[PDB]
Each structure stands twice: as C-alpha cells, then as structure tokens.
Design a protein around this ligand. Structure first.
Ligand SMILES: CCCCCCCCCCCCCCCC(=O)O
Length: 277
C-alpha cells in the first residue's frame, strides 16, 4: 500500500532499494566546479570522491530541492497512493524542510492525500536502517500511521558512534598532540554532532566505539558503515556478532554526500538501545 521514499544520505545499496520498492531522491555534490548526481547511472561514487579529496579537492554538498519532492509527492497523490518519507536529519540539511514545503504545495492540490514525513535525526546507515525497518513494517501489513509511529519510537533509541581521522572535513562542511588521535563522535538527542572521546590510534578508536555501541542493545541487529576500509568494517562486524544480543550485522559503504563531510577512513556503528539516547 503506502510508498516509501528516502534520500541518498541514507546510503542504501541500489540493489536493496530496487528489490524493496523504496525510492530515493538524490542530494548533489559540488566537486571542482561540477554538480554531480548521487543517484542513478551517473551518480558520483565515494571511491571517486575520496580519491579527489586525497589530491586536495574540497567538495561541498547540496540538499534535495523542493521541486524534487513536489514531483514525487504529486505523482503519488495523483495516483491515489499514500507516502512515507524517511528523511535525513533536519539538523544536518534543509532537505527535510524542503520536503515539508513540497508537501504543503501538494496538499493544496490534493487535500485528502496522505504524506508523512519522519525527521529521523539520523544519517547514513542509521537512517538507512530506519527505512529498512519501515520497509519491514510495510511487509507485515502495518499502516502508514503505524509505520510512522514505529519509526518515531525507534529513532530516538538509535545510537550512532563514528570514528574519524580528524575534524577537518566535519568543520569544513559546517555541521560541527593530535598525531594518531582518532576522534570518536555521536549524535546527541537533538541530532547534534558531539565528540565523546579521542583515541590514540585506530585500534583503540574501534574498541571504544564497539564498547559504547554495545553498552545498550535492545535489538538483534547492528549496522557498520565505512568510508574506505571494508576489511576494518569486517573486523567490526565479527566483534559485534560475538555479542549474544547481536544476531545480524548490516554493512554499508558511506555514500559521497556523507563522505564529503566526515572524510576518509571513517568507521561507524549503529545500534538500538532499550531507552531513548
Ligand atoms: C559515519 C558518519 C555518521 C554520520 C553522522 C553524521 C555525520 C555528519 C555528516 C554531515 C552530512 C551533512 C550533509 C549535508 C547535505 C546538504 O548539503 O544539505
């Protein structure tokens, strides 16, 4: 019944969205004078992005435009279809607010139409997992309202711990001895980015991230994301799966919009606690 829409910052694999009937509106990357798509056959990849960033290219990102949500929303209302939009955190992008404005314009044309927008206060794998729980609820025949309620319950309980090389691109992007120091960050209850530890070295950074992620597990699945290093993510995966509470691990490469902000060698772990973080 209801359609599920998300955005390219949820970092869902194309194969998953195709097979799961989830649509994705692309944010853009501005990279050395050109605007790249982040969805479609011509989408910019993180591998290409990070390569350019290593040679000194300072790429910036842009929100989804009101027009994109307009078209999608209007097409759905025209077709008698309900819509759930699992949205990239409102505190990191004006994407959510543009969708809200687009919904306003469409409800003018289609006053009885059904369009729910969830401000996940999330990012990348976290956001993606929320969409995955939303596609699972849809399978189980939950309504749009019930699915909205599920995501609004789960979202505040999602933990996001992420380990970076430094704060350079994070501070450069506007959303935020140091030799061999790996900062560890999280998203607080407001969805704000907040350093919580500075580890001497990647092995310690990972250990700490694993410890914090596994402090409070109330759900059998964890998510690991990585910028560059797929073997490092595998090591996180194995460790996670060694918790009796963790039965599954979803592993997702970071997409280029997120990668533009966090930088290379980023690792992240997403888990769901019993209570709201
Ligand atoms: C693995 C990293 C975890 C992600 C948690 C948040 C990381 C900060 C990323 C900021 C992304 C901001 C993208 C802004 C898009 C836009 O231009 O509107």
């Amino acid at each position: 019944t209801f359609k599920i829409l998300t955005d390219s910052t949820a970092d869902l694999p194309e194969s998953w969205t195709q097979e799961n009937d989830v649509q994705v509106l692309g944010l853009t990357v501005q990279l050395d004078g050109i605007t790249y798509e982040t969805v479609g056959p011509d989408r910019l990849t993180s591998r290409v992005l990070l390569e350019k960033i290593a040679a000194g290219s300072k790429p910036t990102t842009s929100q989804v435009n009101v027009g994109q949500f307009e078209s999608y929303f209007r097409q759905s209302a025209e077709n008698g279809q309900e819509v759930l939009y699992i949205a990239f955190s409102s505190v990191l992008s004006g994407t959510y607010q543009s969708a809200v404005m687009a919904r306003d314009i469409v409800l003018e044309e289609y006053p009885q139409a059904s369009i729910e927008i969830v401000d996940t206060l999330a990012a990348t794998g976290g956001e993606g997992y929320l969409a995955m729980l939303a596609a699972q609820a849809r399978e189980e025949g939950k309504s749009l309202k019930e699915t909205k309620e599920l995501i609004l319950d789960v979202g505040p309980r999602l933990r996001t711990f992420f380990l970076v090389d430094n704060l350079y691109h994070l501070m450069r992007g506007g959303r935020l001895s140091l030799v061999n120091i790996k900062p560890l960050l999280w998203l607080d209850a407001s969805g704000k980015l907040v350093p919580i530890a500075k580890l001497r070295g990647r092995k310690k950074g990972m250990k700490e991230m694993l410890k914090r992620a596994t402090a409070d597990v109330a759900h059998d699945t964890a998510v690991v994301a990585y910028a560059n290093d797929s073997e490092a993510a595998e090591n996180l995966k194995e460790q996670l799966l060694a918790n009796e509470k963790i039965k599954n691990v979803v592993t997702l490469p970071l997409g280029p919009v997120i990668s533009t902000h966090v930088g290379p060698n980023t690792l992240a772990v997403f888990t769901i606690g019993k209570e709201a973080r």
